[PDB]
Symmetry: C7
Subunit: 254 residues, 7 copies
């Protein structure tokens, strides 16, 4: 009736003292194999939890009598292990596809669903990637093949999207002529591709022209800065005013 | 009692040294089959993890005695493999439906739930698609048949939705006449379909007319830019003022 | 010990060369059955992956010896296939209910949880629907019976919800009389149903009347535009001013 | 070795031609049973997919030899069917509880987690409900017993929550007296219940009184409109000003 | 070969006609047991779906021959039933814990993760709760023990959090003295507990004092209204001005 | 054929009448064991649902004949029970770790992923915690070890983060000197740790200094109030102005 | 018929009294093993719930007769235990990978998907991490390898991203010269890396220059404060004005 219960708890007691013994043993073979002062404690806790799990399945093998009282609960605690290693091993199967079917390698400035940065290394569970401002990010591989791996450095040619808000009173032909003269004077702009400068929308306080300019991927930010400084200089020189947010106030003196 | 445990750990030690041996062997047959310097290390780590899994199931086959002590935990670790390959192989089954039941092919400017761009290629796990500004995006196929695959280039005819905010004091008939004259003068607009220019809402600072204009899919952005530049020119010529955000300030001199 | 491993890897090598052979064979029977230049490569990759899976289960049938070493891992990789075809075949079972228990058919301007448009066709995995501006959207059927399928063209009669912001100094009886005269003069408004014009809330810069007007589903947008243009014309004629966003500025000259 | 594979593919070919034959047969018994021109094609595709599934399980019964090679993959593809009919049949089990344990019936203006409207009918997979502006919404029953089914017409008595922003310089006793006189003069307000008119918060541009008024569920919107029009009329008559958004501008002449 | 298929479909035909017969039979014993005109149709549809499921498992028992062709697919469709009754019966197991381990009973004004209201009754699948404005909400119990069940009426003593924005030029000692005099003059405030009136932050347009005042749970809103009306009256009497949103405008006459 | 069905339904009828009998019996032994008037009804409904489940499995044991017709559906309805007790018993396993591996005990003012308050008691399914304003919150333990359990009272020393916006025309050395004099004059500030007062950002209308001041956890809010009142007093005394939101208005008289 | 039911309930009664006995016994061996006054009650409740589960499975072993009536429901309640220990033990398997495959150790100021702080310790279920303002956060490890573990202190070199809004009338060469002189005069800036000072965008009220400056990770905030104070001082000295939010007001005197 209960003699199997009290015997099983006695086996759990000897399982705890042998958990202490094999934790010291795994620390000994850890310092025999490769020295690390803090992971030997967690390896000891892992083999301790495993051996009290083995003492647990021996315990309910002793107490349970009917036909499969140990077998069902053993496959049960194993299914707990299985759903536990769902996310921790799906990163492994994702890391298989990340290099065998590689959408990026170590060196392309990529963007892994949100954060962006050049990949330092694709490891077997993580992707250590230096972001644009030095913060090393590692990302679990089950999140990389969950979202869009938007690469940048795979295509050598990219496109700049300027938006230059000018005032309503400015002549459209003068602004389009000066903008096309600017994007024609710059030699880093690829002149074969789409160079569109036209009126994009009529916003609240201003109109604003889209200037879509293609360039190589390496000179992209340099073009985006140089053309914009050129736009500011030429628009200040040519009298085409940049507008502050306008407002039409109607007075009412009470 | 514990002699099966210490024998099982000895088998794990010979499993580690044979993991080293078969990692060198799989590197040798990798450079025999097809050369790649970095995936042979990860293939070696994969076969290493697999063979310590085989040593693990041999270990708990040695230690576990009862009826199915190896079988339940083996189906367990296999179910861990199964839930791990849930997301990594659902992309494969999605990539079956993506081409056998194809909603898009390589060349249509499409939008895969968020990001948008022409598809370069539909591979077996990803869809490499060049976005509109050169950033190559790959997307896992389990996300494509999770969201709306909103195509653009499947229908040859699309619709432009202008909104032109004009002032309250402007005559409605003059604005509607000039807008219909503009969308009638343009020949790229398909004159058979819906050409609606009517007062859409009365906003806070302005009224604004919706101009729904259909066109071919190739000339869509060119129509949206040319008609809008025409609207700005004709409204500046005809004296119909574009309004800045109005405000009715009531004074109070203390 | 390891002779089963090296024999199993040899079987994987002959599985790779017969994967090449049956990929050429499935390309041959594909061009025999129905010509498509790009799906025969992906069908070849599918039968290639299937036959290396069969070589894999033969491999661990050779290496595994105990009782069910092939059977547990075979049901495992099959359960990987099963969870992979969870989402890819739930669209099929949803597409059964979408037409057998049909909430919409090809032609009703519907809204499938977010995006909206007339359905071109309900296929067996997708619903190709032209949106209101020409973008063909296909939607996986497992998302349609996940969200609200808000139909519009099933009920022939719908309701317009005007909100007309007028100034605080305007007389309420004059605005209600002119609005009821407008919605009574229009004959496309169904005069039997709810025609409510009353003061809805007192906003910050204005008061605003709700004008709830029912109409047929086909004339709905035409009524919403014509009544609103009538409201603008009659309110400009009757002197009831439309207010810009007011503000009460208290001065303080330092 | 491979003779079972090529024989299995031959059986798949006769399964395809008998899929065509039984698709014509199910179309024939469909026009014998009940005529519908488009669902017979999808019923034909369903029985076609089912019979190639039966040919598939016969195929891997032929090729697989060991002990349970057909049985594990058959329970696998069945588990794919099971997880596919997870969401498609949970709506059925929800529709059981929706009427056996009914929180609403056809006629109460209810709100099913987001969208709101009177229920036209509670079907076995959906709840066709007319919203307040004519758009017929059907909602899958697995979403109704996922969220709060906030009923309105179950309780006959509801409460109006007015917020009337008045200026800071207004006398509090005059506003409270006029508001209580208004909510006492109206006879549709239930005088037994909570009639609270007190200063609720001191906002940025104004103070604002909460007027909590109970009424019957049928006269609720009529009370909310009539009392608010009464508030506007009496506050314009009594000189208690309604404030526009105030601002305290401190000058600085450079 | 196919004689089992055509015999199985014949059994499905007699299953459909006996589904009609037992639907009439369950309607007869429903009007024998307890009368309800609309749930007998859905009970008839439920027993109809169950008996075509039994005809289906008899059908694939006839067609499937090998070893467990009926057993695997029967446990499969049962697992479909099981995952279907996941959410529909987890509400039952939550409703066990909701009353055996009760965090609230019928009468405490509680807040069940979002919406808030006094509980009318805790049923076995739902919690009918009247919200503060009469809308009866029922909530599935699997959502209550998913989120925070933030009770209010379990603790008899609660705390009011006033924030009174006053101008920068006001003396801090005068405001703190008048506020402490107000919260000392009110007798419904519990004088033993935390009565903190101090400067909380320096906002953009004003400074604002936090007045944390404890009271009984029944008099909480009455204290929050009475103390605030007292604050408005005493601050208008004592000359401490309430500030409108300030702004420091620097002129520039072009 | 159907005699097992009608006999099974007869057994369901005697299961319903014995469900009534054992519901009265469990009410009798409930008032024998421990009196509670409302949970005996729900315990009666629970044992009623359990015994109609036993009558159901006896029913499909009678009707089902083949090999495991009762066994598969019994493990099925049990798996429904299992997924039902997923969330209702994961709180138990979380409550094990919450006290055996305790990150907080009854008395530390903690924050359990969102809401914050001192823990009154950690029960076996919930954590009754009084929030800072008296609202007793209970939280299911499966949500506590889902989110960050951000403790406050575990570390005795915390840090105040002042932000004091001053005008652009103010001298930086005077503000830094007065702020360091204030945070040096206060003795509750721990003078050993980080006392940083430097210019943090240049906002739109003002500059603003961060004043990071460490203190004990008990005196934290008292320091944050006293230092801020000291800042207001000393800045009003020293002529360093606090700025309202500035604006640079450029006139245009039409 | 029912004698097994009443005998099973009698066994549940002796299971309750032996639950009391073994709860006292586990309290006795708890004070024998290691003293803790409150976890012995919860350990007693855990062994109480376990032993009524054993009495429950003995009860339905007595009542259920057919073939596997105890076995299916026992694997069922065990699967309830398994899905309960899904989330509570996935933290363990995540904590294995967190230290064996370590992306951070105790001491690096890291950011675990949202909240950020230096890790005090990585325990076996949680990561106690002191945030930047003293609030000790523990985080379950199943959430760490769900999101991006964005480290900061792994890379020794990071980057500051200044944005300095200056007025439109300011000369671009003067601002770029003064900014480069400032970031060249500071010696803590790493002069080898990217020192970009160029015009970044033309905002509404101002233009604004990005100043991207790299530095060591320890001096990062000190550089960000010192360079910004230098920017304020040098821009006030050199006459380059900092702009308040501009506005272009057009008058209209009614």
């Amino acid at each position: 009736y209960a003699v199997n219960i009290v015997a099983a708890l006695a086996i759990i007691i000897v399982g705890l003292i042998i958990a202490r013994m094999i934790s010291n043993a795994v620390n000994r073979l850890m310092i025999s194999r490769k020295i690390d002062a803090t992971v030997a404690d967690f390896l000891s806790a892992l083999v301790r939890y495993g051996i009290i799990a083995f003492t647990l399945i021996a315990a309910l093998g002793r107490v349970g009598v009917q036909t499969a009282s140990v077998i069902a609960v053993l496959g049960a605690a194993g299914l707990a292990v299985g759903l536990a290693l769902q996310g921790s091993l799906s990163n492994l199967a994702a890391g298989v596809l990340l290099v065998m079917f590689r959408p990026f390698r170590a060196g392309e400035y990529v963007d892994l669903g949100g954060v962006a940065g050049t990949v330092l290394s694709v490891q077997i569970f993580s992707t250590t990637m230096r972001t644009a401002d030095g913060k090393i990010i590692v990302i679990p591989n089950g999140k990389i093949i969950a979202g869009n791996i938007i690469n940048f450095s795979r295509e050598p040619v990219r496109r700049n999207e300027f938006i230059i808000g000018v005032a309503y009173d400015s002549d459209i032909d003068q602004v389009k002529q000066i903008l096309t003269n600017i994007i024609q004077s710059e030699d880093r702009i690829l002149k074969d591709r789409e160079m569109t400068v036209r009126l994009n929308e009529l916003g609240a306080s201003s109109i604003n022209f889209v200037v879509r300019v293609w360039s190589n991927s390496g000179d992209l930010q340099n073009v985006y800065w140089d053309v914009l400084e050129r736009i500011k200089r030429e628009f200040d020189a040519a009298g085409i005013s940049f507008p502050y947010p306008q407002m039409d106030v109607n007075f009412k003196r009470v």
